[PDB]
């Protein structure tokens, strides 16, 4: 792949882009599906985010963690 400092090609120096044709009925329906699809995934993403917080919090200062900490301390004494 090219780098930042190399010069570009000569033949493909005039064109910029050529967007394809747009179907009016199809595009609007597809846009509607994406808007609902992104919203649904975002809620799932936030739901998974809260699950990670719950799992991490229980591993740090969970009830079983205090039981383990007190048991070893009591055994050591």
């Amino acid at each position: 792949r090219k780098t930042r400092h190399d010069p570009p090609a000569k033949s493909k120096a005039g064109r910029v882009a050529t967007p394809p044709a747009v179907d009016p009925t199809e595009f609007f329906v597809l846009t509607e599906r994406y808007r609902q699809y992104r919203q649904t995934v975002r809620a799932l993403r936030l739901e998974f985010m809260s699950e990670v917080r719950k799992k991490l919090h229980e591993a740090r200062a969970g009830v079983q963690a205090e039981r383990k900490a007190q048991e070893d301390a009591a055994e050591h004494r």
């Binding site: 199809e26 597809l30 599906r33 994406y34 699809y37 649904t40 995934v41 799932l44 993403r45 998974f48 985010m49 699950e51 990670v52």
Partner: protein, 117 residues
């Protein structure tokens, strides 16, 4: 390797020999190569049907939602693969391709019948 930036992504890593593809569901940094170093391997995806006519897919569901929970992006094919399993809703592009197939097939049926008559 030390990269400037990049985002954690779950993608498919190609494998196997020629004419026999085999994708591994893996989670790696976006700026690393396709077959480069990865964090954790999740599952596998066999693209070719076996003697039973089945395309086996493996998913590490509890670990998959762990990486998504911490902010891991998903590529186009993994979302379609997860959409089929039912872990995620059907991708909008999956449905549109289905609808396009029906219309093309309907045109093919009509075109053949018109020539027949």
């Amino acid at each position: 390797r030390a990269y400037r930036g990049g985002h954690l992504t779950i993608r498919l890593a190609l494998g196997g020999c020629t004419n026999r593809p085999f994708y591994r569901i893996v989670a790696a940094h976006s700026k690393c190569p396709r077959d480069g170093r990865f964090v954790e391997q999740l599952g596998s995806y066999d693209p070719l049907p076996n003697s039973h006519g089945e395309k086996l897919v493996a998913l590490n569901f509890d670990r998959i939602r762990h990486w998504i929970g911490c902010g891991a992006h998903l590529s186009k094919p993994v979302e379609k693969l997860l959409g089929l399993s039912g872990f995620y809703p059907l991708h909008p592009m999956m449905i549109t391709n289905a609808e396009r197939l029906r219309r093309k097939r309907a045109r093919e049926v009509l075109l053949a019948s018109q020539k027949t008559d």
